């Protein structure tokens, strides 16, 4: 079989920026990859389409996925409110890594972050489940609107998203 590829079309204050495609490691973390895949197609009746990146810290990461509160306090998985840390086989080795945000052990919901640098201090605490396949330049463009405290100067949204393969 093949690992699924999903995409996000990013917009800045409603102006289309571009498309970022991610490869999800379903062969290493099937449950975590499936969650992100289903939230991208919106097939369970809820998902990432229309949500925003509420926290961007230049040189660190872009965080998003809170489609219920749009502020870091919400979101939910396709398995109920939260699910377990599947495994920590993969590490935060550099720019482009896709990983799950959480609030402690076994609290995965829908929030995730895209690393713009190697973040080894998160290894073993956040489940890495994918990587940017194309469009890393769009993620770099996104960083420009972030700040040291995380607040963005423009509203960065996922205008559309779905599965390519």
């Amino acid at each position: 079989m093949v690992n699924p590829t999903v995409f996000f079309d990013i917009a800045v204050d409603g102006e289309p920026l571009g498309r970022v495609s991610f490869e999800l490691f379903a062969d290493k973390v099937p449950k975590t990859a499936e969650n992100f895949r289903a939230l991208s197609t919106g097939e369970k009746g809820f998902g990432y389409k229309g949500s925003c990146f509420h926290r961007i810290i230049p040189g660190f990461m872009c965080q998003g996925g809170d489609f219920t509160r749009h502020n870091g306090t919400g979101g939910k998985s396709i398995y109920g409110e939260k699910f377990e840390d599947e495994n920590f086989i993969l590490k935060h080795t550099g720019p482009g890594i896709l990983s799950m945000a959480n609030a402690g052990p076994n609290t995965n919901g829908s929030q995730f972050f895209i690393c713009t640098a190697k973040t080894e201090w998160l290894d073993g605490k956040h489940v890495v489940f994918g990587k940017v396949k194309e469009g890393m330049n769009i993620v770099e463009a996104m960083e420009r609107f972030g700040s040291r405290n995380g607040k963005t100067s423009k509203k960065i949204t996922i205008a559309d998203c779905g599965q390519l393969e």
């Binding site: 926290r55 810290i57 660190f60 990461m61 965080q63 809170d66 870091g72 306090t73 979101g75 990983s99 945000a101 959480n102 609030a103 609290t107 919901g109 929030q111 972050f113 973040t119 201090w121 998160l122 956040h126 995380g150």
Partner: peptide, 11 residues
């Protein structure tokens, strides 16, 4: 610091 949490963002 540099953490990625959901709810109580820490230093």
């Amino acid at each position: 610091x540099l953490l990625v949490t959901a709810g109580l963002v820490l230093a």
